[model samples]
Target: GPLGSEAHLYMQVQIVAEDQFCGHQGNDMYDEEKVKYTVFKVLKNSSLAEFVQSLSQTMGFPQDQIRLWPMQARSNGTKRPAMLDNEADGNKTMIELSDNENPWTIFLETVDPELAGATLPKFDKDHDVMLFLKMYDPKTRSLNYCGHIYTPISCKIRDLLPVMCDRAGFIQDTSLILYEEVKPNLTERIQDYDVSLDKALDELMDGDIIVFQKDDPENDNSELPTAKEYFRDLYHRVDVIFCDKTIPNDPGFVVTLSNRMNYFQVAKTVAQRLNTDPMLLQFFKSQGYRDGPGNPLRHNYEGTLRDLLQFFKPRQPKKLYYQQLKMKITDFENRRSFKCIWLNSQFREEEITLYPDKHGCVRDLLEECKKAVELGEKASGKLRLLEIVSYKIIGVHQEDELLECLSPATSRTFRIEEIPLDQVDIDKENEMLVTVAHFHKEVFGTFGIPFLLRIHQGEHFREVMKRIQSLLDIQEKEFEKFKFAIVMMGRHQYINEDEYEVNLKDFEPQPGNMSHPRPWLGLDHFNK
Candidate 1:
């Protein structure tokens, strides 16, 4: 009788049993235990015991002495029963080829107990002896030379056992110590890449690992082949680009977008470029390859790019720098503008329009970003132009609005440039000034700038007045009566009142004969 759409395939298998955790006192005798390979064609209808018998025979163990027991998965919430019941005729139980799709049953057994009716030592739970197997077709598997095995539990065995222990539960054993097989020369073909596991389960995939493309070469006029050109021969051809903030030397790749492009198409193209198997690779919408530790914001592959975009578009940088800087200014719902902000080595702040239908112009969006500066204020005319000389990122504050007014001028020289108070309400007191600072932080914060939150209104003004009055010793009522506008210093360096006091201390006594001597001269000199 046929079982639906099920089919059997030829796969090479290797099985090795070792202590789940070595160094336990119980594992002293079985410390050097080893097991190896047995290639076979696994059938969907094969009995669990038959598979066990096949594996035992390959390990050179007598079929009669081997006792098999299964484990239940902890995921299903079951009691940890430590006994295997008699199910001699349960040959109806089937085996699964892949352990990931379904929970595969774990078979545990001890060969040749020394004493009759003697209770076997319980297997170490944490550091228990382990059985590992590798399985796959020798001809089709290209990345690694090793054929197949039962799941080779890497790092931790208890964690790996639950996946294979879903069918049955409970078994007790005594005298069985932890054992590990010696590796044969042919098995030396096992490489680090094959077993390199990512602690992040989401980041891991089954296939050839992909590597990001290197930065484009200099003085090399070689044009990167179009996505269609590169993957023309490959099925479902797609074009993809790699982007990285850390790799300043080679920050990104250029990919041409077409109307017919889908997510799988783009992913396959990137997989080819990365030299990794397509089945195992995933494209995530993120700036970095790895997700954040505490706040994981991973948008991994689901389906086509068109399908994903319907859900939500990833928020790109207001301006991205590669070879050149591309600034994005959002207006209405679909009215977003993107244009290059650098021309050659100079900051141009050029204005360009992006049609609603396309991503960018035919020219590369990031091509001009090489050696591009972190973008400055779009509206302010007094911005200092910086060159992308090094990959070192400036402080977050330096990348924002206030930096445009701070960098070029000194504390005493810089003036507070007025902002356009479009619809903002002004208060009666100097609160309006504080509101303006908050506005700048809010407006320019989108472009990666941070500003001081507090304004220090009366505290700063009163401190400055006290310092000046202290120098005069004598108080004047007329000075108090007269109204004067206390100008607020604009430079970030001038924010500290202590520095002003230190500068005032540089002055001492002044003599009439020696005009503007000592304190007077020092004050004059500083004022100049």
Candidate 2:
């Protein structure tokens, strides 16, 4: 029932097939040569009946028992490169899906679930690290499997979203903010707010999401909507007084929360305020409308904005993401098949490659795959091997206990000195905050490049570089200078760069954003 779950490895008479190294299977699009095992999650509602039906169609299986297997999963111990080697010899083991829960006659040794999570404990921000796993079997209509749990940890609510966002490689997007906090009485003008706000806004693009909220625990739900409405009205009144005009209704707002309000009202009210800039409305013909429930604004905004150049914009390229490898794929075993010709007649003139052995034992192939994972197939693409360390992650979690995380700061009540005291409205209140975001990456070595896992293409490597930096507020150049620049992209490959290559053995660096407190030049509230 969780977002993801661990494999429930419970099988007997496991159809254990091995090469010299470890590997399971692969398709033409991925892992063509090496023996690597691919680990997949059983999405919710996946079942054996469905799996068997699909298998029958894909593999041409005729017997119900032939396709009926209780469970299916690649052997985790198998490495990647070796599996690819096994494929060359037609070495693969196929698992049949079955109607019975344990029909395959395979068995898995149960290990401690806590121990498993402990073994690969994610070492990111404590509130940021979410861990879960899933398992599914096709059979018995009786057996159902799902396990979901959030680690019991005392952490701030605001810190949670960023962890997921950061993990997904979504840097600061102006379209979304979590909340807006107010210090009450304060000066508004700050030297860097204009510059930082522009940067954040530009990054959001057109179709992004943003949120704002006040950190009132009691006002979390709608039954207490009055409290948030109290604050929201306070904020609106203040803005109206300050600007002597309506605030530019930004369309990017997705959710806003107050100490007392239901999530629905929070969304509905902000939606009602949506309107186009009057200046732009003259140039265009119609203005954007509100979108609260029953507001009838959705159709008007879409129909009118159809030809509005102000809203029409080019899309940004998808951001690249860095994903760690979980398993390897290769042929089921090291089996080589060959056809012998009576003379030399079977070979074509353009090319001929020969080998005396038609098939080899699974044991031989497994060994080669193991070497690939351990030593890393350098020739493949300079992909480096990264092993998850349970203890280190646990330690990192402990280190993150200090900060009192804040939600996205979007709107709050602030006392602007320039505005007259009586003219400023106290109905809605929140300070407008602008922050300059940055991204930085670190590798294991002194040079800061990630340790090579396999030889991945340069373009693929660059994508990962950009994604990680966007979230971590680091730069690609900074990571390239590190020594641990050896990790592979998904499977394997070495990245071609202009700098000296860095290896895993060089040095290891921590993950997560590291910021230095700027000089307190005493801007707003600096004296207080």
Candidate 3:
């Protein structure tokens, strides 16, 4: 009458602490008097909610913030926790057996659902066949025994690859095909990249091996993006700074990554949110100025995050500054390298190799130089690139011109300079007019009449903002609440106080006009 008859069997629920996720379980120091594990007692009759409630109370997290994974229980206690059955149900309880001496054990995972990753299958025993999985490492040309897997006879490869690879000691790259040794020295390569392994299962009986082989003899077995959820808790925390100075705001997103997860996994995650492809992004880990941030040490896009972070021995998660690239760079041959020096920041010189998509143009490389010199959109408005001829200055290029159209002759060095605005030569008489509006979203219908701002020539919006400050002579503290933006046709793009330096002359404006009393800007606040 074990679990078949409902006699309220008891099982153990163990908490997965953070340090252990990053592989620090063995070296960490804690008092022996302190309880090493947070094991909870549960019954088959209890719902998942009751278990979560008990955990949230002691751990002090909102019940919704907690996640419990049903795992393959071991006979004794372990610092290694238990394995998850990707298909286990949290709503139902006591999935484990408690018939023998060492009661069944499950695991508790704490995570932010918004930042969650791929789904992980459990180390389930239900469809259990204790199978040993092997990895055919191409470099060594030897099949290495990675670990054990409790497999289901019918699970699809998509549902099972993550579990297999994790056990196989490499991040799963589904691109690498799976095979079963067919006799003494023969094998069959899997196709459709789909279907169950049963084709191999029937053949697997007498062979005694479930093996994964590299697509080629030279692939660096890295992870690829898959649809399954690996659960954000399973990866390490990575704070990513969106360092595109041209972007109006400094908003940032922290990505969870590790050797277990792919770089492109986070790349695609962050890119989709930014509406782009993974290859159109570049990330740099900082150094030289490690006392703080900035001064990139290297431009790395290959390998795992751990490979990128190896210099810092502690494995404490650190910040990585990321840039929005002008185009996608998919090949190793498409790169053009250069050295750059910025105007500020301890006069540091950094090297960068540009990789634009095959379709990239001069406009894309123009954007690249802005990134190189670390110029913000406002400051780079009149950025000029001077083509040189040994000691002579050739003509300048425009925004639409391709880099090839600049005449790819051999005296290829170029110079970068901002067009001096001091000589725009303006008369103070009859300034241009533009509209600005404010809203009191005390309610949806709350809006004010669009007013005209008399902008001065050659003066950035910050220059013209002086009179408006005097017009509304409010307290100095509350003035921070009033913000500014630029309205193109009708689109409102807020300008940071930092961006008030933007001058719109020559900057392409929306060509045609629709219904509006002239183009405008808007005033707003964070909460309002």
In lDDT terms, which candidate is top? 3
> Model 2 over residues 1-528: C-alpha lDDT tens digits?
553243343322222112211221111111224523322223223544443345435434332323121123223321111101111221222222322334242211112333423232222222322221111111210111111123323343333444434433445432222321111221122122223322333221111112232233433443323222333433332111011112243233222333233323322343344332221211112222322112112212333222321221244211111111122111212223221111111111111122212243322222233333322122221111111121010011121121122111123111101111222332223211111111123111111111111112222434434444443353546545532222211121233534433332221233352332211000010010
lDDT of 3 by residue, 121-147 (tens): 343444444444556555543445544
| TM-score of every model versus the real structure | 0.21, 0.12, 0.26
Candidate 3 — worst ten consecutive residues by lDDT sum?
224-233
The model with the greater lDDT, 2 or 3, is 3
- Looking at candidate 2, the ten consecutive residues that score lowest on lDDT are 519-528
- Sum up the clashes in candidate 3: 18
Deviation in Å, model 3, residue 447 alpha carbon: 62
Model 1, 122-146: lDDT tens digits are 4333332233322111122111111
**Candidate 2, residue 429: how far the Cα is off, in Å:** 70
